[PDB]
Amino acid sequence: MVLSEGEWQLVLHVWAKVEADVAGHGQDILIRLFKSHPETLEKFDRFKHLKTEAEMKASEDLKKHGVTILTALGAILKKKGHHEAELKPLAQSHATKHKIPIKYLEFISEAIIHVLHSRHPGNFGADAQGAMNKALELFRKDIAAKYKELGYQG
Numbered sequence: 001m002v003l004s005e006g007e008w009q010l011v012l013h014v015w016a017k018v019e020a021d022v023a024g025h026g027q028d029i030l031i032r033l034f035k036s037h038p039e040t041l042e043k044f045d046r047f048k049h050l051k052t053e054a055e056m057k058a059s060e061d062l063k064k065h066g067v068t069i070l071t072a073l074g075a076i077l078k079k080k081g082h083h084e085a086e087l088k089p090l091a092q093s094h095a096t097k098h099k100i101p102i103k104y105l106e107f108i109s110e111a112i113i114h115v116l117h118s119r120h121p122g123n124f125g126a127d128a129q130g131a132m133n134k135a136l137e138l139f140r141k142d143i144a145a146k147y148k149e150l151g152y153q154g
């Protein structure tokens with residue numbers, strides 16, 4: 001898949017807004033993911049004991065990790081499709097060390113789109129959401145292809 005420059009502009013326009021508060025968006029996203037799909041929490045050995053959203057909101061650790069995730073995703077989106085080098089080390093740790101199925105990447109894709117829709121309605125109308133969805137589908141397709149080369153699958 002290939003996004004047009006107009007689509008990348010809609011994606012980087014709303015991402016510039018997310019970058020005004022990276023830690024808050026990171027938090028929102030991970031909590032949304034853990035509440036919606038609680039099975040995903042079991043993958044994190046560092047955060048699986050968290051019982052409630054209040055506990056999640058108060059974890060400093062969880063918040064730092066949300067900044068780590070979003071910084072890594074933001075550096076990929078800014079490449080505008082030329083992200084091969086960035087994807088390599090991310091695909092190798094998530095397929096070999098963390099063991100994250102593609103289905104979970106779909107779940108966090110959904111969580112991103114939910115949070116952007118709630119925090120940025122004006123910059124996340126239907127065309128912008130379609131371009132963000134296209135950018136994350138591209139990311140999942142490329143990561144699934146790398147998963148295959150690395151030997152992870154199902």
Ligand code: HEM
Pocket residue numbers: 040041043044045046068069070072073089090093094098100104105108
């Ligand atoms: C937008 C998609 C994602 C991005 C960009 C992302 C990125 C990261 C980054 C940069 C790290 C630290 C470096 C490394 O271990 O590779 C990381 C660690 C990790 N990731 Fe992801 N990730 C994504 C989705 C997920 C999903 C969906 C799960 C599980 C449901 C997951 C589980 C983990 C685990 C278990 C760690 C280790 C956390 C800790 O250090 O203990 N990741 N991820």
